[PDB]
Design a protein around this ligand. Structure first.
Ligand SMILES: CCc1ccccc1OCC(=O)N(CC(=O)NC)Cc1ccc(-n2cncn2)cc1
Ligand SMILES: CCc1ccccc1OCC(=O)N(CC(=O)NC)Cc1ccc(-n2cncn2)cc1
Ligand SMILES: CCc1ccccc1OCC(=O)N(CC(=O)NC)Cc1ccc(-n2cncn2)cc1
Lengths: 256, 256, 256
């Protein structure tokens, strides 16, 4: 009946909205802030400084807000947005504040059982990290990306918007927006046309993206050559600009 | 010491046989039925509608009977047989009743630490799912199959009786009965002759199965041509019929 | 306030040093011995016969000292040294005493989330097992080895001192000291020069080891031929002797 179970431990410094639910044997640690409509299951460990937004769901056996591995006492933070689902056994680490490297998760994400979000990672909105996906640290996952079960992501990799990885992919380089990748080591296969159609992209945009993939991957061009050729299409289609920008911001080279 | 620990939470609608043991801080949810001689460890989450048979053992940090990912309020079920061992951290999801697709586990299975059994999967008898094996959903695992640690199985795949996967195999196609598969992506290597000898298969049946593997994999035959060539041997040896039948029922093609 | 939380369960046969901390809902099982300065987190399961040394930290949802898979009642043990960190969800199994095959962990090790240490495994000092690394059983990990996230190790493998595995590596053979291995199946790539520099190895020692790698992997020599050509260098440099000794004691062959 009581929203906060009497068997839960709520640190005196934690700040909760009035309707937050916390299950039995859960720990809401010092410096944890939890927003309206959030439901914390039983057996959850929350550590701070962490901000959890509204209408989130965190399942049993999760450890959210764990320590970042420059100096002792350096402020760190984890920020989670709204309408996220964090399934059982998920581990999420905090990130450093002063260098703008906090760990941050946006809205409407689904982080499935035993997934791992390493320190300083940034997840956008509407992403899906399937069971046991592991982000080593400093990984950027843009909107609508889907990482299938047991995908591994090397530190500093960028996962483009609407990209997709096959199960067991081992990502060591950047994944451009819309690109589908598979295997260990991951290799580019195609584009996520299915995702584009579900998102309501025009047939013209999809056609421009199919041509864009060919320019980058099938016409023997260098990254510099491909970027120069994409400028025109990118200026005309915002979806092609999303693709072009992801190749431009690749620091680890692109997955091929 | 009381069989049902006073620190566990037992829903009034749960039905436990008189000798059932439940450890501290476990939750036995509504519509969970537990049979004679079953031992639930501490820190277990059981959710229903779920039926657990006799003489099972469920270890700590497991979540058994989690929600399946057509309509709101559709009755779903999980059925577990007898003499099974579900180790720490295992996750098992329920499945839909209406279409006869509930999640089902038979008898004498060993489901090792952090293994995942996705919605609508069906496991037979005497199977071994090693640490972190993950069945995406709608997977059928036939009797005596052994999936080595960290094996990944794509949705709708069928794992044949007495088959074997090496550690870290990523299975995207059906695995015929007796076949040994390895790697990411999985590739067929041989037959599990060691398993046949442990089961007491005759020298004649083993010989016929060795010839059958060659018909399918080493003589350039198409699946259709292979199935016709095995017809005679399958009528004479029930074990060859198991192999032929697994290739016949392969909807995603066979692992090569 | 109290060092042993009143919500923890301490078996009457367990032996703890006076200053041991045990968090809420943790179970310190029968025949568990815990040394000075060790901190057991909440939701931890410790099973014995197990010895845990001094200044260790064991995190939530870990199962340490679980049963090993000759006869019923054969004495089995797990021994952990000092200054180790065992992160969330780690599973560590005991090993047999009679044949001197107990599971042993030395000092200053870091065993990261969901790692698995199988029965009869031996971990030295200053090792790092990254998230979800799994040692099947009977694995020997020598000092300073680093196994990246999701590394899988086959039973009976030896991981040499200062060696390194890339994320998702599937190790089926021995890894010589200082060697870097990657992929599924694992392949030798180079030497851990970064590790050598962190240990303050001389310029001569770092150069003799680079020469040693070439003798074994780049000059078309057989193992017996390579061991002969290393004999002179091993006599002058103790670090080359460590490399030579790991190749000489390889029972499953060397990773190539
Ligand atoms: C074997 C590893 C594994 C383990 C567990 C699950 C799947 C696994 O591999 C398959 C996989 O990752 N996907 C395919 C699949 O299961 N589709 C349903 C991608 C995927 C896409 C979307 C979603 N969800 C969207 N809302 C809820 N879930 C789920 C998965
Ligand atoms: C590194 C991944 C990994 C992680 C954990 C364990 C093994 C792992 O890989 C090895 C593996 O999966 N097997 C080999 C092995 O450990 N044999 C003992 C298959 C196997 C066959 C049978 C059993 N049983 C256990 N109880 C009864 N049967 C266990 C394994
Ligand atoms: C995706 C799998 C994965 C999952 C989780 C983490 C990393 C993962 O892969 C990367 C990886 O395993 N390493 C690279 C890396 O993260 N370096 C910081 C090796 C490594 C080396 C040293 C240490 N630590 C030393 N002291 C404390 N930790 C950590 C990792």
């Amino acid at each position: 009946m009581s929203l906060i179970d009497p068997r839960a431990i709520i640190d005196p410094s934690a700040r909760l909205a009035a309707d937050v639910q916390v299950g039995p044997w859960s720990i809401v640690g010092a410096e944890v802030e939890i927003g309206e409509g959030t439901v914390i299951g039983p057996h959850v460990v929350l550590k701070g400084p962490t901000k959890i937004g509204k209408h989130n769901r965190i399942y049993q056996f999760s450890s959210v807000g764990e320590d970042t591995p420059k100096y002792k006492g350096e402020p760190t933070r984890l920020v989670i947005g709204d309408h996220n689902v964090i399934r059982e056994g998920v581990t999420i680490h905090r990130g450093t504040v002063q260098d703008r490297a906090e760990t941050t998760i946006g809205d409407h994400n689904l982080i499935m059982a035993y997934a791992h979000i390493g320190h300083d990672s940034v997840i956008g909105n509407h992403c899906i990290l399937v069971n046991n996906t592991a982000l080593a640290g400093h990984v950027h996952v843009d909107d609508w990306a889907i990482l299938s079960g047991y995908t591994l992501v090397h530190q500093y990799c960028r996962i483009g918007a609407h990209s997709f990885s096959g199960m067991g992919s081992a990502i060591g380089k950047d994944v451009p927006a819309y690109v589908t990748v598979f295997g260990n080591p991951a290799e580019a296969r195609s584009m996520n046309f299915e995702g584009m159609r579900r998102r309501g992209f025009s047939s013209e945009a999809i056609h421009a993206l199919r041509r864009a993939y060919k320019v980058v991957y099938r016409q023997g061009h260098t990254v510099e050559e491909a970027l120069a050729e994409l400028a025109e299409s990118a200026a005309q289609f915002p979806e092609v600009a999303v693709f072009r920008d992801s190749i431009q911001s690749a620091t680890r080279g692109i997955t091929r």
